[PDB]
Design a binder for this molecule. Structure first.
Ligand SMILES: Cc1cc2nc3c(=O)[nH]c(=O)nc-3n(C[C@H](O)[C@H](O)[C@H](O)COP(=O)(O)OP(=O)(O)OC[C@H]3O[C@@H](n4cnc5c(N)ncnc54)[C@H](O)[C@@H]3O)c2cc1C
Ligand SMILES: NC(=S)Nc1ccc(F)cc1
Lengths: 1199, 112, 56, 56
């Protein structure tokens, strides 16, 4: 039995002094980074004067010398230019020239462009950036289709031919040096004869499967032979070289997979380097995301020390000056060069992933960014690092990659007058940098060599990541700006930074991750699992957590209670005892409710701000205790380290969010319900546990906390922390055990509300028990039930397969598919289904399944043997029906726990899936594009509606699908899991829940007797059918009811449309819609009129109980209203409903509540009032519960 | 400028639909498109496909896309003013078909 | 000013849209009122003309 | 505003204007009345009935 966490994340090698100084700088404050960079980049007055003169001469030359001419010649609008280029691209996909020319003359130029040619506009975002200099994540394909029709009808074949010629020159000659290495090598002869050199980029990156990595490997190998043959012994300085990306060579290139990286990726780079050695060409390792920097150093160290590579100085390595570690990375590389005796080629760049680094750090709640946030800081860093490199030209070969004429001039003068080929060089990109460096290379200019980075690839590969390859801060954009003087362009960034009030101050408009929510609340903090110091510290904290004697006891107000005690086992390894639980007797559960009722007034009397302070103090304790809590969650619940971090962060976020919502809303008039039973699941055993409890507690209610039988230990620790934060023992009682405990709590007479997250079947049993009871005030007992979903993702032919596969793998198999939001059904447009499926299967087989006390494990166990058998029975039934089933092979070590291998099942129809399968099992169906609307119907027809994903670049598809799908959490161009508190408020409709959304602003209002007005909760929209109904009421003489109807129309928040603060590169939207059809159960005519007003004002239709006998009360309705009204004798035949409004005395309400609980389908949120309450209280019915909350999260970095 | 009902036929004077009424084949005006698809049009197209009226179902989908219903533009003008231009449904369209397929095409055009 | 704007606007809308396939109707009768005796007079006539129709 | 520093507030407008590439250039984001419609077309021009030169 392996000791827990003994092998969590051991580093590749012991960390040297120089490596530790790199790690220490990972997220160092920008105000601490910049002063030493400023000092290192400081040059003499004379040098700065000469540099400004040289930069002025270069920028003047540049300004005194394509698509814009085409737009001008044909008077094209921006959208027409984009549409034309999209059309040209598609025409160029036609292989044979004469065929293309025939289609243009005989079909396209006649307007019939739709007929012959996936959308034309799939790559419009890229052409948009080409044409307008602006980037969008998605494409307005209806605008582009109109523009294309307009321009063809106006200008005909001549403009099509010109577009085709332009796109052909740009894609085959400007974006790439060549379509193949052979072609690119032929095109390099010209500028090589003028004194340039070349480094060829075969455009591979981010391999998804073993097959992709092998394809990129064999592309690199073939290019190395081609380049080495062309080099013909010119050597590494005068001859051409190659640039490779490590992410192209292995599908799991990451610190978490360091063992596989050293065992599988390293020998591949060595084999390529050996071939480059044999031809004596350069081989450069490109730099990628910040969390791969230090891992790439371990590979560089092995390669440079490998004797088989000796005698060759062609190995190169990129360092990114926008990174805070850059000078310490350079120190390490220069020392490695000295130790190995290899003159490492060091390419200094600024960096290409800035936007993605900002977004990632914000998502992960890290201390700071790993890159600078002001462009001028990157410029100072670059000059500072160039100074370090120029002092070390005897042991490294510096390569100054920049298009910035001021940067160039500063370095040129810094380097001095002694030069020789091989001392250092400049570099630039093909197409972009030649105008500048034609002013540099050659004895008649500055006599410094420049190496051209030459992309190589076809139209498919080029258009992929060309977007990343033009922003307002870019030199290349600013040199083209007529409102930018040369004096602004030759300004010394070193001296500008030195004169700022705070040297190194963060950019004003970028939030640190902890400040993502501003004054509202402090964001939770995560941990950087790529940081070796963090991994070392966490390993020890995790080992310590496994030496703790974790226990859970029935913690009543009077103290701990005795009971039946059993052990809690690691689901990944039943030999690993995590702790022991003492389970609550049915008698003690009932006693706890009576103790909670006795203490309810005392807790309700604590001022809401002090209740919130308890929650805020609990959040601080959880944050401080995060490493220990991780260890418990990993072993008790079978979760991976990353998912445990997210779980602890989610708990902290709930505490702080509901504390802030309380400070925004609650006063003395918002009385508590009373004792609330909180029943939590095993799949989020801290986060959902904490969320329900914190909401009920802060609303002024004492809580009976019943955790899942499988995960009592983290629950007991959560209660301990809440009590330490100030929650009295009488306000928070812990009752571990099985469903007998849950049932006893739910049935207790003093139970005033139930919060349940779990299966729909248990939720329905709770609803039936609660329908027998009424509150002391004669109202139904509130139930907040969050249940499963049959969550789907729709992917069309415009989506990027690699992005789809990563989002699918994560959404379906993260946490072994045991998320309520997990992706259950993937719907692939038929044209791309085979390609995406092949990639998905390849990605599936790269997952590591095992006991989760290892950082390398991607997917852990399912929670129990019963869970495992249930899931595996489903898989075998599908296989028995002849469905194609793909499964990963599991290691023998999994036999000691309960694992289900991640599985892909290909279905014929969405109807083949007739049950929720709560495990790592993805179902795949294919659809024809014209059947999209019917497919959305099929998704909706399941009755579920939790999470939904859509991958498309087409706005028309987004608008259509998101307007037709009925789901509470929508995700566009991203995964569908990990909804963030206050950002994607979480909760579905139909079979997926009652609402209101957890982590949203309606949640606390359900836990008090009088709901407050939530923050930002209002709408200026008035339902027009409500307005027709109020006029009808006035026409009938029902004057008071008409006024109440107008008041309901005003008070309704239907139409609310908010953007919620979150990270950059994402838009998070929160909207209130109609719920659907509300069951009305009136007793009197006035009561019916009030109920109808409430329902119509919130956008709903109604079904009115025909047994009320009130049909004559609605004669001569306007057709608009009549369209919304039906009458129901058989309620269960006319559903599903989305809610119910009931009028009557207590006996009638109870009878109706029980009848509604028997309706099949969704658990209806029921509101009841007496006839007298309808007359007295304008809020007899609450409009919060008659609208539907929708959260939509759109990835706007997706292009 | 121009209204509805007893106020005129349209299209609006000084607007982008005007010239199209004066030619036998109207062009696509500048900026004249919409990403919205009428949902009843979509329901009609599915019904048509259930019937096997494939040509008409295809015609209906194409009408749904080329419709500019839902257009919502801000027009350039002076500071201190916001000038908006939107395309809405007209109301109830009189359909005078001769054939079943003619009726399906007319209904698609009106629903879209 | 309105007459000038009509002229320039219908001119620009023509440059944005009209092609050989957008055939003219033919002779257009333009009947104008006394309350905008130049602006509406001009707007109707300019539109009909620039669309390729002779005007009465 | 905590963003604006005392240096910004103390800058000499006379010398900042003197150093600009075109002294007295119109604000880049404010359209001259003639340019209200950008490259689409030239706005019609009125007459200033408060200007005595114009009235005469
Ligand atoms: C031949 C060559 C090879 C390259 N190889 C790589 C590589 O392997 N890996 C890699 O990551 N990059 C690489 N780059 C660099 C990257 O692709 C961009 O070309 C480069 O950053 C442009 O910088 P500049 O000096 O040309 O232009 P500039 O306009 O001077 O600099 C722009 C750069 O400043 C930075 N920047 C912009 N805004 C901010 C901000 N708010 N805060 C902080 N920094 C900001 C960004 O890094 C941006 O790229 C390479 C560049 C060249 C020429
Ligand atoms: N596993 C649990 S807690 N089941 C439960 C709870 C209440 C009830 F009425 C029925 C079942």
């Amino acid at each position: 039995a392996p000791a827990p966490f003994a092998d969590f994340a051991p580093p590749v090698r012991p960390q040297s002094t120089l490596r530790r100084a790199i790690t220490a700088a990972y997220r160092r404050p920008e105000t601490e980074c910049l002063p030493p960079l400023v000092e290192a980049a400081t040059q003499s007055k004379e040098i700065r004067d000469a540099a400004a003169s040289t930069a002025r001469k270069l920028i003047e030359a540049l300004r005194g010398k394509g698509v814009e001419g085409l737009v001008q010649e044909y008077s094209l609008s921006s959208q027409e230019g984009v549409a034309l280029m999209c059309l040209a691209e598609a025409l160029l996909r036609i292989p044979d020239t004469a065929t293309r020319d025939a289609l243009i003359r005989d079909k396209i130029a006649d307007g019939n462009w739709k007929s012959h040619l996936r959308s034309l506009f799939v790559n419009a975002a890229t052409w948009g950036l080409v044409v307008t200099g602006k980037l969008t994540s998605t494409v307005n394909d209806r605008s582009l289709a109109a523009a294309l029709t307009r321009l063809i009808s106006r200008c005909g074949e001549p403009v099509i031919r010109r577009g085709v010629d332009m796109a052909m020159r740009m894609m085959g000659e400007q974006f790439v040096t060549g379509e193949t290495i052979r072609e690119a090598l032929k095109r390099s002869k010209e500028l090589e004869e003028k004194g340039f050199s070349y480094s060829y980029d075969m455009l591979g990156e981010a391999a998804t499967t073993a097959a992709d990595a092998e394809r990129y490997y064999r592309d690199y190998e073939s290019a190395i032979h081609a380049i080495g043959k062309a080099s013909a012994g010119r050597g590494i300085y005068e001859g051409p070289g190659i640039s490779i990306k490590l992410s192209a060579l292995h599908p799991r290139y990451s610190r978490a997979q360091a063992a596989r990286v050293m065992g599988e990726l390293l020998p591949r780079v060595k084999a390529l380097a050996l071939l480059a050695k044999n031809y004596d060409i350069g081989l450069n390792i490109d730099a990628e995301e910040a969390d791969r920097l230090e891992l790439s150093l371990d590979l560089l160290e092995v390669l440079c020390l490998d004797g088989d590579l000796s005698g060759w100085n062609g190995m190169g390595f990129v360092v990114q000056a926008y990174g805070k570690r850059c000078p310490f990375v350079l120190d390490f590389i220069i020392d490695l060069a000295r130790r190995s005796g290899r003159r490492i080629m060091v390419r200094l760049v600024k960096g290409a992933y800035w936007d993605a680094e900002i977004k990632r750090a914000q998502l992960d709640g890290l201390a700071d960014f790993p890159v600078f946030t002001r462009k001028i800081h990157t410029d100072v860093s670059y000059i500072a690092c160039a100074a370090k490199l120029l002092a070390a030209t005897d042991v490294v070969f510096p390569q100054f990659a920049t298009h910035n004429a001021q940067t160039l001039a500063a370095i040129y003068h810094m380097a001095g007058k002694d030069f020789h080929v091989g001392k250092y060089e400049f570099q630039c990109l093909h197409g972009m940098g030649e105008p500048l460096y034609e002013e540099v290379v050659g004895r008649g200019k500055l006599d410094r060599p420049c190496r051209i980075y030459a992309p190589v690839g076809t139209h498919e590969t080029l258009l992929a990541y060309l977007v990343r390859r033009g922003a307002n801060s870019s030199f290349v954009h600013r040199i083209n700006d007529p409102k930018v003087s040369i004096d602004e362009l030759i300004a010394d960034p070193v001296e500008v930074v030195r004169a700022m009030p705070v040297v190194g101050a963060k950019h004003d408009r970028i939030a640190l991750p902890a400040e993502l929510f501003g004054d509202a609340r402090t964001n939770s903090a995560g941990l950087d699992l790529s940081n070796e110091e963090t991994l070392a510290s966490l390993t020890e904290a995790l080992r310590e957590s496994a030496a703790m004697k974790w226990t859970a006891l029935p913690q009543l107000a009077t103290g701990p209670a005795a009971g039946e005690t059993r052990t809690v086992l690691n689901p990944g390894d039943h030999r690993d005892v995590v702790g022991s639980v003492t389970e609550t007797s049915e008698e003690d559960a009932r006693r706890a409710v009576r103790l909670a009722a006795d203490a309810a007034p005392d807790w309700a009397a604590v001022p809401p701000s002090e209740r919130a302070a308890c929650l805020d103090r609990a959040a601080e304790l959880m944050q401080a205790r995060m490493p220990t809590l991780l260890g418990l969650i990993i072993r008790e619940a079978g979760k991976s380290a990353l998912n445990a971090i997210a779980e602890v962060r989610e708990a902290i976020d709930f505490l702080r969010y509901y504390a802030e919502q309380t400070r925004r809303t609650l006063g003395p008039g918002h009385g508590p319900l009373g004792p609330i039973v909180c029943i939590s699941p095993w799949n989020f055993p801290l986060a959902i546990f904490t969320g329900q409890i914190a909401a009920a507690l802060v609303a002024g209610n004492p809580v009976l906390a019943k955790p899942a039988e499988e995960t009592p230990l983290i629950a007991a620790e959560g209660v301990r922390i809440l009590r330490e934060a100030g929650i009295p023992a009488s306000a928070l009682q812990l009752l571990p055990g099985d469903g007998r405990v849950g049932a006893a709590l739910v049935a207790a007479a003093e139970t005033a509300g139930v919060m349940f997250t779990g299966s729909t079947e248990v939720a329905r049993l709770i609803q039936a028990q609660l329908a027998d009871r009424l509150s002391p005030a004669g109202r139904p007992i509130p139930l907040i039930a969050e249940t499963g979903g049959q969550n789907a993702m729709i992917v069309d032919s415009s989506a990027l397969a690699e992005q789809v596969v990563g989002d699918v793998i994560t959404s379906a198999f993260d946490s072994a598919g045991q998320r309520c939001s997990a992706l259950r059904v993937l719907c692939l447009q038929e044209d791309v289904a085979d390609r995406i499926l092949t990639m998905l299967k390849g990605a599936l087989h790269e997952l590591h399944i095992g006991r989760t006390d290892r950082l390398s494990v991607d997917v852990g166990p399912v929670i129990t043997s019963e869970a495992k058998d249930n899931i595996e029975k489903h898989i075998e039934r599908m296989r028995g029906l002849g469905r194609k089933v793909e499964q990963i092979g599991l290691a023998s070590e999994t036999g000691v726990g309960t694992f289900v291998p991640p599985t892909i099942i290909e279905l014929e129809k969405l109807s083949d899936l007739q049950r929720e399968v709560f495990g790592p099992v993805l179902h795949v169906i294919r659809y024809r594009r014209d059947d999209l609307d019917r497919l959305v119907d099929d998704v909706n027809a399941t009755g579920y509606g939790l999470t939904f994903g859509l991958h498309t670049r087409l706005d028309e598809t987004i608008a259509h699908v998101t307007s037709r799908i009925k789901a509470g959490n929508l995700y566009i161009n991203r995964n569908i899991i990990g909804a963030v508190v206050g950002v994607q408020p979480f909760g579905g409709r139909g079979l997926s829940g009652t609402g209101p959304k957890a982590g949203g602003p309606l949640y606390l209002g359900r836990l008090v007797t009088t709901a407050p007005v939530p923050p930002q909760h209002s709408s200026v929209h008035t339902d027009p059918v409500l307005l027709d109904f109020a006029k009808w009421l006035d026409g009938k003489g029902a004057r008071a009811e008409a006024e109440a109807a107008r008041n309901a129309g005003s008070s309704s928040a239907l139409g609310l449309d908010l953007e919620l603060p979150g990270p950059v590169g994402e838009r998070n939207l929160y909207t209130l819609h109609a719920r659907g059809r509300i069951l009305l159960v009136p007793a009197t005519e006035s009561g019916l009129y009030h109920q109808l007003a409430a329902a119509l004002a919130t956008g709903n239709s109604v079904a009115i109980d025909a047994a009320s006998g009130l049909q004559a009360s609605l004669k001569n309705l306007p057709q608009t209203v009549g369209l919304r009204v039906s009458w129901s004798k058989d309620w269960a035949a006319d559903g599903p409903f989305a809610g119910a409004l009931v009028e009557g005395d207590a006996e009638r309400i109870r009878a109706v509540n029980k009848a509604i609980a028997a309706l099949p389908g969704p658990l209806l949120l029921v509101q009841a009032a007496s006839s007298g309450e309808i007359a007295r209280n304008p809020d007899a019915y609450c409009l919060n519960w008659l609208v539907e909350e929708v959260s939509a999260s759109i990835n706007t970095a997706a292009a």
